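Blackboard transcription, Thursday session:
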Amino acid sequence: VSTLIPPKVVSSKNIGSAPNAKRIANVVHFYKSLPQGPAPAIKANTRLARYKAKYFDGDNASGKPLWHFALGIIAFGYSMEYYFH
Amino acid sequence: FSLYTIIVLLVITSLYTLTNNNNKIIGSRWLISQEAIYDTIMNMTKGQIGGKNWGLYFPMIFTLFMFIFIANLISMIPYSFALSAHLVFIISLSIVIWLGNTILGLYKHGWVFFSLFVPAGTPLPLVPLLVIIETLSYFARAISLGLRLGSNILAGHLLMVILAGLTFNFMLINLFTLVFGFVPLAMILAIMMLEFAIGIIQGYVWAILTASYLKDAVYLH
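(Written on the board underneath:)
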């Protein structure tokens, strides 16, 4: 004889179907993350890492590193050809 | 030649390892140069071998694709890395690919693989001729893959070499120091832009042909 109780029965009722499914996905995606640009890790110098933080950086990454690599390759090849040819 | 083949390994290993500053989702300036080619590869592979088992049989076509296109790229440096002017490796691995798709067909189909050389519907009095018509072309297209890439790359390498060697009297003693006397340099530059174009296009088209042979192998037509 008791009336229905919508706001009293919300323990099992969630927000539709998709919103409750994505609530767990969105609650923790924003929890454990850097606030703003933390840990840049820019500093690196290990020849390969020296190239990474010197010319191979993605801020520009223009053809200048490629031209420098080609210049070094042809400089080595000149001596190689002198040895061979 | 061994040290020169390691160089292309180092350059394309650095394509991602020496590119991503922090492995950002937005992508670095050289991560894009590889994800774009990956997108193109997945696109025309699902276009050509579209259906089941295409994903399982995509990766080796992909690997051949970068192999060939950076192999063509290194042929731009003036001491051109055109396989050290030997280029027989292309033929050997073309034969390898032919054996690979032959075994693919022989395992996926077996006796049905012999029906790959005959189409679905043929006239009865004319099938015994068309079977041998379609067979020898299939066994023969094991050098056609090699001579294509070999042709383009080393033909370019030796034509620039020949033009450079033929350019002896252009400015030292010849009084014509204009483009009339500098035709060698002009056609050298034109044929090098042509070389870059044909290298990239031929890498893409050989990817297409290898995907087509794989489609002929794993499926029946």
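Lecturer's comment: Helices of chain B lie at 2-13, 32-48, 59-73, 83-86, 88-108, 127-140, 144-166, 183-218.
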